[PDB]
Structures are given as C-alpha cells and as structure tokens.
C-alpha cells in the first residue's frame, strides 16, 4: 500500500 | 531538460518467412513522457499497432514497448519511426533480422 | 533472500488537453503487481499480477480511494512548482516519485526511498539516515524547509520501517512463489557475414526472467570486452527477455571463441560455439 504523499 | 530514445525493433521469435510473429519497437530512456510512435511496412505506417503502459526506470527515463503482429517475408521491410520533444526530426529505426 | 516493496508515481500536466495525468505503479522485486491510471470515466486501482486477485473489495476501494487523494494533492504540487520555478502556466510539466522499502531476509528495512524528480531531474529525496531531506535547488529547498517543520522525515520512517514492510509481507504471502519464479535462457550462436575475410557471432540469450543476465565471449581464456557488441537487455514481450552479443572473428578461427552466458536460473553458465549445421 502507497504513502499518502505530503504536499510539496 | 530531455532526453533522447533510444529504440531497438526485433521479433519475439526468431524470425521465419511465412511463420506469424510479434515485431516490438522498444523506446527507452526518454523524457519527457509524452511520444508518438508508429511501426511501419515498406514505407507505409501500420493501423493495427499496440502500446504497452508507460514505466519509468530508477534513473527517471520513461520506456514503453509497441508492437505489432507479422508474418515476416524475404523481402518486406519494417521500422520503427518515433517523434519526440527532444529531437528537431522524427527518428526512423529499420528491422535488422540478425539483431 | 531481500525483497523491496516500490511505487513508481507519475504526475504530468497538460494546459488546455486536460487535468494532470497521474499514475501509481506499484512493485513487488521489481514486478508490477499493481496500477492506477487516472486518465479514466471512472479510475481505479488495478491488480497487475493474477495473485493480487485474492485481494477482497475493501482493499481495492481503500487504494482507489487514496489514489485519487494522492493525485489530487499532485495536481496542487504542479501548480505550486510552477510558482517555485516561476514557470508558465502553458507548458506541461512533470513529478515523479519513487517511494518504497526494500527489506533483508530477516525482515528488517535495509532502504528506504522517497525520492522525488521534477521534469527529469532530482528534485529532493530522503536521506539514507532517514531522518534528513538532500534538496538538488533552490526550489527544493522550500519544501524541505516544509517537510523539516511539519515533521515529514519522521512520517516516512515510520511507513518505511513499518506500514511498507507490513504490506510487503502480506503481498508475498500471496505472490512469493511466483516472484520466485526463474526462466533460465536457452541459448544459440548465429554466424553472419558480407563478402569479406571476416565474420560476426551473436550469441543469442532468449526466453528468460529475471532480466538480470550476462553474456561474455572468450578467445581461449580470455574475455573480449574490449570490441564486443552487445544490446540492452529487452522484452519479448510475453514476460520473459532476450539479449545478444557479438564479436568480429577471422573467417576459419570461429571454433576458437567460446559463449558464456550467465543467468540466476542456470545451474551453472552455459558454454557455446558456433554449430554450423549439419
């Protein structure tokens, strides 16, 4: 299961 | 900044006149992403061509593999012609039996 | 052995075509075991690999559900580098990920990667110590300024260390066998030559998988690395992979070169020579 990504 | 294809256009199977085959034209290490590749039959572009879905490698280049179903001849000749942002004019790779 | 659990993340615009295209690609030792492709009526995430398939409906609605947070917060990232980079709101534009464990036989993490790219360049990744942020530019560095305040390097250690591991566990029980699946090359030299006092040998490498492979010629002993030929390793296009190399030899001397080819399903590596046929 992927990461829920941050904003850059 | 962008990088240029690479492409290699072989048969899934060694190739026999007569014998239905696969032909792949295999583009690699481009950027960006976005390309139009088109196989082509003594000079004419091919209808029924499909693209597998688009990866990219650990180096960031993206590659895809289109290929097409074939019977190849004696004297028939094929290649692969792809146009992409990084080059002024589409490239043109030709079929090679011994490679 | 190790084993490595990655995403591969795409995100590309394109002003006036449309919304962003994004992509989730997803890895399990290098093999695409699953995929979400936004350019879709009603987009999903998909198994890529036949063993996913034993998956039930909450895991798939959880993952579709993430994915599309994940590209819309993408679609937003777009939009901020634009700013970062004081770049044109015409031009397509693309981010890129690569985030994932890979473990040792003992199960701990022995990498963790999060590591982002911005139209084909290093953008800023996650430092082995798992705790720092490596920003290529000065764009970079607003958002490692970000992550360091918000405590981001944290938040991925934790998922590498755990959640990641976690999922690669559960992925393999249902797929281990079938990753370690092996299809040794099957080999072949072919002779090929212009009207000259010299010839080619390709040593053909076919059907095999892993890519992962090597393929040596010898003159009595001695490796000829110096002039040989060789191609890329690539697909045939039916999960398996073919490779070739080949060396320029004196007409008559071809009996006195020798083809190794070297592969993780072999035994031991296959010796061969030029047959011409009977």
Known sequence: SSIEFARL | IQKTPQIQVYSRHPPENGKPNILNCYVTQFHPPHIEIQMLKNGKKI???????????????????????????????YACRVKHDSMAEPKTVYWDRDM | GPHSLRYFVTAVSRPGLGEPRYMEVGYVDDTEFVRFDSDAENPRYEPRARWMEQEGPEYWERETQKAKGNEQSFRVDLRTLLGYY???????????????????????????????AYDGCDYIALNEDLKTWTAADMAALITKHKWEQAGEAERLRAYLEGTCVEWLRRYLKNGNATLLRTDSPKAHVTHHSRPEDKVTLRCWALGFYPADITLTWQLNGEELIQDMELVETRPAGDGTFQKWASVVVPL???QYYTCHVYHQGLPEPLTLRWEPPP
Request: with cysteine; glycine share 10%.
């Open chain 3, 86 to 116: 004081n770049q044109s709101k015409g031009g397509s534009h693309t981010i890129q990920v690569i985030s994932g464990c890979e473990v040792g036989s003992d199960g701990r993490l022995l990498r963790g990667y999060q590591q982002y």
């Open chain 2, 47 to 77: 209808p029924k061509v499909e693209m597998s879905d688009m990866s990219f490698s650990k180096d960031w280049s993206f590659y895809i593999l289109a290929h097409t179903e074939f019977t190849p001849t004696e004297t028939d000749t």
């Open chain 3, 252 to 254: 008559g001397k071809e």
